[PDB]
């Protein structure tokens, strides 16, 4: 069995990754027994304190332990460009809460695609290509998940590629000049190059006819390369569109979150405010599973978690975008103070949610 361990090497570190590889594996033999996903940020060994920010075990270490040691990179006309792994995308993957194994299977699909591409599997005999489509209603994290997926793959494939690239083309819009810069990045075969075309449905809605055909033909060229992956998103979940998108061999529906997911999302927001001490004092909050084990009995330990559970349920229907914005509105409208008890914040969050749906009915 294989266990994955992501090692965040400090930007200021100059040590070889083989040295870090041996240090981290000594640390794991020390602790050796693991209960689940655990992350060390403080170390006793001074070589690790110097060169490693965090060691995270991610989903008894007699399994096969795979280390992924990476450094974050701290820093083209109509395109955004990041060198991967990018500091901007650090923590994005974990901030996206989907139902079980949406992100897992998506990672595995692209992993198999890259494996098949790397071994020159004949696609006439086994179906695969280099295009990925996430489709969903707007605000479900599709663009973020593409970026987070590109970051995960670069980190997980650090043995085959030395770094990654992400080019985000802004659909709202020389075309030869942009794809020349993309080809220069592809020319470096030590790099896994991701090209992200957001909301491709706007292309078929948009003189405008020539620009589209120019981009589709440029896409057809770069996808001929082994180190290229094309990520696309569509905010219309149902409709058919453009060839390379409709023929994408990986299609994933991304819908709005369930009440179970909303609960986790809110929990992550409340944890963050407690970490920053905007919510003070800190209090213990229960997960759904923990609530289910006590049959949802209302007592001092559970009262506030039950209240959050009920806020999550009347939040059903809202997108993730709105959900992670509501704690900001809750604080700005109903707290307006540097500090607030969790009781006060949950009440504020509840009002903010009601306000969202009042605004909704006015649009109806
Ligand atoms: N399922 C989710 N869980 C947590 N946060 C989410 C989720 N979906 C969206 N968000 C938040 O909304 C932000 C913007 O979403 P975005 O990726 O632009 O949506 P889309 O591209 O699908 O329109 C994300 O960066 C994220 O913080």
Numbering used by the authors: 19 to 77, 90 to 105, 119 to 216, 228 to 260, 272 to 429
Sentences copied from the publication:
Recently, the AAA+ ATPase TRIP13 has been shown to collaborate with p31comet to promote MCC disassembly and checkpoint inactivation. p31comet acts as an adaptor to recruit C-Mad2 to TRIP13. TRIP13 then induces the conformational change of C-Mad2 to O-Mad2 in a process that requires ATP hydrolysis. We have determined the crystal structure of human TRIP13 in its ADP-bound state, and identified TRIP13 residues critical for p31comet–Mad2 binding and for coupling ATP hydrolysis to Mad2 unfolding.
We subjected human TRIP13 E253A mutant (which was deficient in ATP hydrolysis) bound to ATP and the p31comet–Mad2 complex to crystallization, and obtained diffracting crystals. Structure determination, however, revealed that the crystals contained TRIP13 alone in the ADP-bound state. Even though the ATPase-deficient mutant of TRIP13 was used in our studies, the residual ATPase activity of TRIP13 E253A presumably converted ATP to ADP, and contributed to the dissociation of the complex. Structure of human TRIP13 bound to ADP is highly similar to that of the C. elegans PCH-2 promoter bound to ADP, with an RMSD of 1.57 Å for all atoms. Both contain an N-terminal domain (NTD), a large AAA+ subdomain, and a small AAA+ subdomain. ADP is bound at the interface between the large and small AAA+ subdomains. The only discernable difference is located at the so-called pore loop. This region forms a helix in PCH-2, but does not have visible electron density and is likely flexible in human TRIP13. Because the human TRIP13 structure does not form a closed hexamer and has a disordered pore loop, we used the structure of the C. elegans PCH-2 hexamer to guide our subsequent mutagenesis and biochemical studies.
